[PDB]
Amino acid sequence: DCSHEMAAGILKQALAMGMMTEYYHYIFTTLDLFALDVEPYRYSGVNMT
Amino acid sequence: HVLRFGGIFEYVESGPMGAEELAFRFAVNTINRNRTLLPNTTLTYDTQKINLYDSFEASKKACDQLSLGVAAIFGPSHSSSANAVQSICNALGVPHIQTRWKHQVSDNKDSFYVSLYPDFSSLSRAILDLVQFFKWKTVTVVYDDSTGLIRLQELIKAPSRYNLRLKIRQLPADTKDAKPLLKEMKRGKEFHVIFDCSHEMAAGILKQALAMGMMTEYYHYIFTTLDLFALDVEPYRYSGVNMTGFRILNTENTQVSSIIEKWSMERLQAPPKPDSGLLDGFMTTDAALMYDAVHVVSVAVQQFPQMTVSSLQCNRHKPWRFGTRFMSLIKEAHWEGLTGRITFNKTNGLRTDFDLDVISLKEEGLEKIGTWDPASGLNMTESQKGKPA
Amino acid sequence: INLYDSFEASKKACDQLSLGVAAIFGPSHSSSANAVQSICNALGVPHIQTRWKHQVSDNKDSFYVSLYPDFSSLSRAILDLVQFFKWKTVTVVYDDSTGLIRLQELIKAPSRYNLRLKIRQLPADTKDAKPLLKEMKRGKEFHVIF
Ligand SMILES: *[C@@H]1O[C@H](CO)[C@@H](O[C@@H]2O[C@H](CO)[C@@H](OC3O[C@H](CO[C@H]4O[C@H](CO)[C@@H](O)[C@H](O)[C@@H]4O)[C@@H](O)[C@H](O[C@H]4O[C@H](CO)[C@@H](O)[C@H](O)[C@@H]4O)[C@@H]3O)[C@H](O)[C@H]2NC(C)=O)[C@H](O)[C@H]1NC(C)=O
Ligand SMILES: *[C@@H]1O[C@H](CO)[C@@H](O)[C@H](O)[C@H]1NC(C)=O
Ligand SMILES: *[C@@H]1O[C@H](CO)[C@@H](O)[C@H](O)[C@H]1NC(C)=O
Numbered sequence: 001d002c003s004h005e006m007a008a009g010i011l012k013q014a015l016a017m018g019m020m021t022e023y024y025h026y027i028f029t030t031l032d033l034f035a036l037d038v039e040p041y042r043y044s045g046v047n048m049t
Numbered sequence: 050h051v052l053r054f055g056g057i058f059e060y061v062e063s064g065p066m067g068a069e070e071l072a073f074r075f076a077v078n079t080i081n082r083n084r085t086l087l088p089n090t091t092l093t094y095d096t097q098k099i100n101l102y103d104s105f106e107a108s109k110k111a112c113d114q115l116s117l118g119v120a121a122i123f124g125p126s127h128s129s130s131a132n133a134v135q136s137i138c139n140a141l142g143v144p145h146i147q148t149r150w151k152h153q154v155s156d157n158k159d160s161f162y163v164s165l166y167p168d169f170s171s172l173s174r175a176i177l178d179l180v181q182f183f184k185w186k187t188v189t190v191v192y193d194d195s196t197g198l199i200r201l202q203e204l205i206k207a208p209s210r211y212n213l214r215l216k217i218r219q220l221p222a223d224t225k226d227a228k229p230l231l232k233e234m235k236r237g238k239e240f241h242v243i244f245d246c247s248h249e250m251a252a253g254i255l256k257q258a259l260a261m262g263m264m265t266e267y268y269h270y271i272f273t274t275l276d277l278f279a280l281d282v283e284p285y286r287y288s289g290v291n292m293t294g295f296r297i298l299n300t301e302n303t304q305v306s307s308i309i310e311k312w313s314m315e316r317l318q319a320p321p322k323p324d325s326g327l328l329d330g331f332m333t334t335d336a337a338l339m340y341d342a343v344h345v346v347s348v349a350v351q352q353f354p355q356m357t358v359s360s361l362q363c364n365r366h367k368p369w370r371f372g373t374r375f376m377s378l379i380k381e382a383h384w385e386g387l388t389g390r391i392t393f394n395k396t397n398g399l400r401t402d403f404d405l406d407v408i409s410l411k412e413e414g415l416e417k418i419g420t421w422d423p424a425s426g427l428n429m430t431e432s433q434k435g436k437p438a
Numbered sequence: 439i440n441l442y443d444s445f446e447a448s449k450k451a452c453d454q455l456s457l458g459v460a461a462i463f464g465p466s467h468s469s470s471a472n473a474v475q476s477i478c479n480a481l482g483v484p485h486i487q488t489r490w491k492h493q494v495s496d497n498k499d500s501f502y503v504s505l506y507p508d509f510s511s512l513s514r515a516i517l518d519l520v521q522f523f524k525w526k527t528v529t530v531v532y533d534d535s536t537g538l539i540r541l542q543e544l545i546k547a548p549s550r551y552n553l554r555l556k557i558r559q560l561p562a563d564t565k566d567a568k569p570l571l572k573e574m575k576r577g578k579e580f581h582v583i584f
């Protein structure tokens with residue numbers, strides 16, 4: 001539950017921390033998830049909703 | 050006195066001078082100063098630039114340099130041009146130095162060449178020792194070029210003498226097409242992968258693996274290249290990936306770091322690349338091998354006081370008058386340079402005895418954990434801390 | 439020419455091209471074949487090869503043809519034979535290291551199908567097949583690809 005800018009920063013940190021794989025899930029309460037750049041995450045198999 | 054060295058380098062056809070050319074010129078300059086070796090003879094150098102991956106142009110430039118007359122020829126990187134230059138040098142008796150590995154053919158009877166690259170039988174035995182230390186069972190070897198299958202002969206033959214199972218996969222011709230290969234690798238649940246490619250291909254593979262989610266704490270990578278410490282591990286430090294590799298550049302010494310810092314100015318003259326993921330200001334091991342090659346040639350020709358360079362013609366097979374005593378002096382040389390101690394093996398000019406630093410990726414960064422030797426085997430100091438006595 | 443001399447083969451090729459020929463039928467070696475192929479590609483003369491040689495992928499010569507069957511298709515034929523015979527644990531004995539180039543597809547086939555490879559190399563002496571056959575006998579292996 002944060003803004004989309006904080007969501008982008010958190011997703012970059014989670015990619016760096018190795019928590020972005022098929023074994024995880026992420027639900028974002030923000031309404032600007034379509035504004036995110038999901039290009040460096042879509043092949044990792046994460047489940048972003 | 051004067052002394053001329055022949056140098057053939059595949060050039061960029063662009064702005065900056067390529068790798069090992071700056072190393073050769075810098076090393077020739079730094080041997081002339083600090084007058085401890087060769088106190089009465091200076092070194093001149095001749096440099097020819099040839100096309101990429103052509104052998105006839107290399108043959109013509111080698112014939113031109115022998116028409117000028119040189120004491121030795123520092124050959125190119127590609128294997129075919131190295132074979133042509135080695136055939137010319139072994140015919141005319143001029144000693145030949147190789148700084149890159151090439152495919153050694155068994156029935157070739159040449160004896161006027163040496164190579165300072167570490168031989169991949171010893172490197173494959175070191176990799177096998179590391180695999181046996183890590184208690185693996187199923188290893189996936191991913192190779193880039195087909196000649197790497199020659200470079201991993203002992204690793205391929207090692208399932209005959211152990212219980213190790215081996216799956217071998219080839220990278221595609223396209224660099225960025227590693228996504229279906231990594232998808233097939235994670236679909237088959239392979240987590241112990243040995244990558245055999247260059248450092249730039251290793252960086253591209255690591256970027257693809259981070260994009261494919263392959264880089265967790267569950268995986269493990271072993272890189273056969275010796276330039277693992279020149280990679281950028283900043284986006285992979287906190288992910289817990291067990292990366293392991295070998296380093297030959299003895300950076301613990303003050304002298305090696307000082308020479309690296311001197312070379313870093315001319316390295317910083319060359320521009321870096323932003324998306325390559327390589328740290329600038331680092332010596333490529335090819336450049337350090339060229340540096341150590343001209344220093345071991347220098348300490349070999351220290352012993353010779355009768356260095357008379359004679360012009361030779363390629364239209365006749367008249368051998369050079371001094372080359373046997375030279376080739377004995379290079380093959381009986383004991384010099385320590387940037388790559389540790391250089392000791393040429395007998396019966397072949399290739400190099401078998403060296404010292405390697407087994408490095409691995411900790412959370413702080415790339416850290417040396419082990420030491421490997423052909424006779425001593427594997428030290429692995431963090432496994433040696435338990436000393437019940 | 440002599441045994442595996444690239445410079446001598448290059449000198450004979452220059453002599454024959456000074457005499458002038460329509461095409462050059464190359465030797466059965468590898469490195470001298472590469473040197474003759476580079477000479478023929480530089481001077482624009484066709485070069486016909488008979489024995490297989492290892493081809494570098496980055497080479498861009500266009501003045502040579504090869505008449506030995508390419509070992510990619512041969513390796514695919516051996517995989518078709520093995521898949522027809524329905525084997526599980528096979529043992530490849532190779533003599534020269536370049537034969538490992540010749541069996542790329544068969545080596546890569548355990549990544550695709552269910553197979554096991556035991557890969558062994560003949561020693562440097564041609565009469566020393568007895569310890570390798572002893573290791574074959576102790577391994578209890580009964581599908582050997584030579
Ligand atoms: C100069 O170059 C030549 C040519 O390469 C060198 O000869 C080779 O030297 C290697 C290292 O000394 C030898 O390597 C090993 O093989 C040992 C056992 O092989 C034995 O059995 C076979 C039959 O299966 C015989 O043919 C052999 O002669 C030998 O009796 C093995 O114990 C060695 O072990 C190291 O690695 C294993 C893991 O792989 C570890 O468990 C060990 O602790 C060691 O760390 C090597 O594997 C090789 O046999 C020699 N011959 C050939 C033809 O390659 C020569 O030594 C060089 N000169 C130098 C370095 O001074
Ligand atoms: C995540 O999404 C994928 C869609 O490809 C789906 O198959 C899977 O069941 C989802 N859940 C988990 C826990 O992976
Ligand atoms: C990876 O390295 C860490 C270092 O603390 C080690 O504890 C861990 O066991 C290693 N993982 C594997 C799979 O080797």
Ligand SMILES: *[C@@H]1O[C@H](CO)[C@@H](O)[C@H](O)[C@H]1NC(C)=O
Pocket residue numbers: 425428429430433
């Ligand atoms: C391993 O290295 C330590 C120091 O790093 C040394 O004291 C020890 O003798 C070495 N052992 C072997 C077998 O080389």
